[PDB]
Design an enzyme around this catalytic site. Structure first.
Site, PDB file in Angstrom:
ATOM      1  N   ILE A 106      25.594  37.423 -16.283  1.00 30.22           N
ATOM      2  CA  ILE A 106      24.821  36.200 -16.459  1.00 30.22           C
ATOM      3  C   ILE A 106      23.336  36.399 -16.202  1.00 30.22           C
ATOM      4  O   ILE A 106      22.556  35.464 -16.408  1.00 30.22           O
ATOM      5  CB  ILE A 106      25.363  35.059 -15.573  1.00 30.22           C
ATOM      6  CG1 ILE A 106      25.338  35.474 -14.104  1.00 30.22           C
ATOM      7  CG2 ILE A 106      26.766  34.667 -16.006  1.00 30.22           C
ATOM      8  CD1 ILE A 106      25.742  34.375 -13.157  1.00 30.22           C
ATOM      9  N   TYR A 133      15.072  41.864 -10.302  1.00 30.14           N
ATOM     10  CA  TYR A 133      15.731  41.421  -9.081  1.00 30.14           C
ATOM     11  C   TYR A 133      17.083  42.093  -8.874  1.00 30.14           C
ATOM     12  O   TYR A 133      17.565  42.157  -7.738  1.00 30.14           O
ATOM     13  CB  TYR A 133      15.906  39.903  -9.115  1.00 30.14           C
ATOM     14  CG  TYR A 133      16.508  39.403 -10.409  1.00 30.14           C
ATOM     15  CD1 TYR A 133      17.883  39.381 -10.592  1.00 30.14           C
ATOM     16  CD2 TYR A 133      15.701  38.967 -11.454  1.00 30.14           C
ATOM     17  CE1 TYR A 133      18.439  38.936 -11.772  1.00 30.14           C
ATOM     18  CE2 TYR A 133      16.251  38.517 -12.641  1.00 30.14           C
ATOM     19  CZ  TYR A 133      17.621  38.504 -12.793  1.00 30.14           C
ATOM     20  OH  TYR A 133      18.184  38.058 -13.967  1.00 30.14           O
ATOM     21  N   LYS A 191      21.132  43.058 -11.108  1.00 30.32           N
ATOM     22  CA  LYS A 191      22.040  42.607 -12.153  1.00 30.32           C
ATOM     23  C   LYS A 191      23.018  41.603 -11.561  1.00 30.32           C
ATOM     24  O   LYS A 191      23.699  41.897 -10.573  1.00 30.32           O
ATOM     25  CB  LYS A 191      22.788  43.785 -12.781  1.00 30.32           C
ATOM     26  CG  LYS A 191      23.343  43.492 -14.168  1.00 30.32           C
ATOM     27  CD  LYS A 191      24.014  44.717 -14.772  1.00 30.32           C
ATOM     28  CE  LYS A 191      24.507  44.433 -16.184  1.00 30.32           C
ATOM     29  NZ  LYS A 191      25.251  45.584 -16.768  1.00 30.32           N
ATOM     30  N   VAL A 192      23.075  40.416 -12.158  1.00 31.64           N
ATOM     31  CA  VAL A 192      23.898  39.322 -11.659  1.00 31.64           C
ATOM     32  C   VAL A 192      25.140  39.202 -12.526  1.00 31.64           C
ATOM     33  O   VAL A 192      25.074  39.345 -13.754  1.00 31.64           O
ATOM     34  CB  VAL A 192      23.105  38.000 -11.630  1.00 31.64           C
ATOM     35  CG1 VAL A 192      23.923  36.897 -10.971  1.00 31.64           C
ATOM     36  CG2 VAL A 192      21.788  38.192 -10.902  1.00 31.64           C
ATOM     37  N   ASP A 201       8.413  33.578  -7.471  1.00 33.20           N
ATOM     38  CA  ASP A 201       8.752  33.668  -8.887  1.00 33.20           C
ATOM     39  C   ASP A 201       9.554  32.442  -9.317  1.00 33.20           C
ATOM     40  O   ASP A 201      10.605  32.549  -9.950  1.00 33.20           O
ATOM     41  CB  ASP A 201       9.515  34.958  -9.179  1.00 33.20           C
ATOM     42  CG  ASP A 201       9.624  35.242 -10.666  1.00 33.20           C
ATOM     43  OD1 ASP A 201       8.566  35.342 -11.318  1.00 33.20           O
ATOM     44  OD2 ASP A 201      10.760  35.360 -11.186  1.00 33.20           O
TER      45      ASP A 201
HETATM   46  C1  LIG Z   1      21.691  34.958 -13.132  1.00 32.90           C
HETATM   47  C2  LIG Z   1      20.989  33.773 -12.471  1.00 32.90           C
HETATM   48  C3  LIG Z   1      19.645  33.412 -13.127  1.00 32.90           C
HETATM   49  C4  LIG Z   1      18.583  34.503 -13.180  1.00 32.90           C
HETATM   50  C5  LIG Z   1      18.029  34.947 -11.840  1.00 32.90           C
HETATM   51  C6  LIG Z   1      19.008  35.668 -10.935  1.00 32.90           C
HETATM   52  N1  LIG Z   1      20.030  34.792 -10.366  1.00 32.90           N
HETATM   53  N2  LIG Z   1      20.193  34.778  -9.006  1.00 32.90           N
HETATM   54  C7  LIG Z   1      21.183  33.933  -8.794  1.00 32.90           C
HETATM   55  C8  LIG Z   1      21.685  33.378  -9.979  1.00 32.90           C
HETATM   56  C9  LIG Z   1      22.814  32.459 -10.078  1.00 32.90           C
HETATM   57  N3  LIG Z   1      23.156  32.002 -11.292  1.00 32.90           N
HETATM   58  C10 LIG Z   1      24.232  31.209 -11.395  1.00 32.90           C
HETATM   59  N4  LIG Z   1      24.670  30.892 -12.647  1.00 32.90           N
HETATM   60  C11 LIG Z   1      24.198  31.051 -13.938  1.00 32.90           C
HETATM   61  C12 LIG Z   1      22.889  31.456 -14.216  1.00 32.90           C
HETATM   62  C13 LIG Z   1      22.547  31.700 -15.532  1.00 32.90           C
HETATM   63  C14 LIG Z   1      23.495  31.549 -16.533  1.00 32.90           C
HETATM   64  N5  LIG Z   1      23.197  31.847 -17.848  1.00 32.90           N
HETATM   65  C15 LIG Z   1      24.095  32.705 -18.621  1.00 32.90           C
HETATM   66  C16 LIG Z   1      23.334  33.379 -19.744  1.00 32.90           C
HETATM   67  N6  LIG Z   1      22.691  32.388 -20.603  1.00 32.90           N
HETATM   68  C17 LIG Z   1      21.984  33.041 -21.705  1.00 32.90           C
HETATM   69  C18 LIG Z   1      21.772  31.577 -19.809  1.00 32.90           C
HETATM   70  C19 LIG Z   1      22.508  30.869 -18.691  1.00 32.90           C
HETATM   71  C20 LIG Z   1      24.768  31.132 -16.161  1.00 32.90           C
HETATM   72  N7  LIG Z   1      25.122  30.880 -14.894  1.00 32.90           N
HETATM   73  N8  LIG Z   1      25.010  30.788 -10.391  1.00 32.90           N
HETATM   74  C21 LIG Z   1      24.663  31.215  -9.173  1.00 32.90           C
HETATM   75  C22 LIG Z   1      23.595  32.042  -8.950  1.00 32.90           C
HETATM   76  F1  LIG Z   1      23.332  32.435  -7.683  1.00 32.90           F
HETATM   77  C23 LIG Z   1      20.913  33.957 -10.987  1.00 32.90           C
END
Ligand SMILES: C[C@@H]1CCCCn2ncc(-c3nc(Nc4ccc(N5CCN(C)CC5)cn4)ncc3F)c21
Length: 263
Positions: A9, A14, A16-17, A120
């Site tokens: 996701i 930062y 890889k999530v 950020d």
């Molecule tokens: C990765 C994120 C955000 C970045 C920055 C990095 N960071 N850090 C924590 C999270 C985070 N994100 C979600 N959920 C989420 C986020 C984006 C998406 N996306 C899927 C791909 N799509 C193209 C856009 C939406 C789905 N669920 N739930 C809990 C979290 F702690 C994220």
């Protein structure tokens, strides 16, 4: 492993999530994140576990920490950037902005009161629960310049007003559904900013920065109701104070929470 990855996701500087299953806690979706291989990391992790003791409703909850380093968070189904995409015409309801803005300023105020700077703050880190709650992520642990404060671009100060400038760009994007200042570099980003807010005073320009004030020629301070549409008289005063060039004169999150816009 205690968690089972299902899908990526997020990726970036930062880490890889991943979206994962909490195999031990009922199969709930969680957000995994790994950090690289130090004692300054020991510092930033204890802060993250300390803010978790407060369990603030406007920050993403930290479920676990493992050992290079894995960070488990509560998965929230979507972020702000995909919320603004899927929102119907003609945009976000005027009070949905006011509520989300308050949740944003509360999470930031909680972060600032404990002396943590997000550094950020952007729509990709702002997450929206299925209930509609704003939960902040990607902070307390160490490219789009569209939300950088002018003092970060100029490379002078990196204090808490940096996050309040970003709040201004998110405020205006919740009426535009498109980024306000969208530059292709730090010198272009600062230009697209000054073209709208106006060339500040000579004493408002920080010292020892390589870019002098005389470099730009954004002659006039433009009215913000031209670049943002559908903002009330209070939404203008609040947004103007977030988009104040001098970080010292800029409004704090604590002072923004107690503003006529949130009555
Ligand atoms: C990765 C994120 C955000 C970045 C920055 C990095 N960071 N850090 C924590 C999270 C985070 N994100 C979600 N959920 C989420 C986020 C984006 C998406 N996306 C899927 C791909 N799509 C193209 C856009 C939406 C789905 N669920 N739930 C809990 C979290 F702690 C994220």
């Amino acid at each position: 492993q205690q968690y089972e990855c299902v899908a990526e996701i997020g990726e970036g500087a930062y880490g890889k999530v991943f979206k994962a299953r909490d195999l031990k806690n009922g199969g709930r979706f969680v957000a995994l994140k790994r950090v690289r291989v130090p004692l300054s990391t020991i510092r930033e992790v204890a802060v993250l576990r300390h803010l978790e003791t407060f369990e603030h409703p406007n920050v993403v909850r930290l479920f676990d920490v493992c050992t290079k380093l894995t960070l488990v968070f509560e998965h929230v189904d979507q972020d702000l950037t995909t919320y603004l995409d899927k929102v119907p015409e003609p945009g976000v309801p005027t009070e949905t902005i006011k509520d989300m803005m308050f949740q944003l300023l509360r999470g930031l105020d909680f972060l600032h009161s404990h002396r943590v700077v997000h550094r950020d703050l952007k729509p990709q880190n702002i997450l929206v629960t299925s209930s509609g709650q704003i939960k902040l992520a990607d902070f307390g642990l160490a490219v789009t310049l569209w939300y950088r404060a002018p003092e970060v671009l100029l490379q002078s100060s990196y204090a808490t007003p940096v996050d309040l400038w970003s709040v201004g760009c998110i405020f205006a994007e919740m009426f535009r559904r498109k980024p306000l200042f969208r530059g292709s570099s730090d010198v272009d980003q600062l230009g697209k900013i000054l073209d709208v807010i106006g060339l500040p005073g000579e004493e408002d320009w920080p010292r020892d920065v390589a870019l002098p004030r005389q470099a730009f020629h954004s002659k006039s301070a433009q009215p913000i109701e031209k670049f943002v549409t559908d903002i009330d008289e209070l939404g203008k005063d609040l947004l103007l104070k977030c988009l104040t060039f001098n970080p010292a004169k800029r409004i704090s999150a604590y002072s923004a929470l107690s503003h006529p816009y949130f009555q």
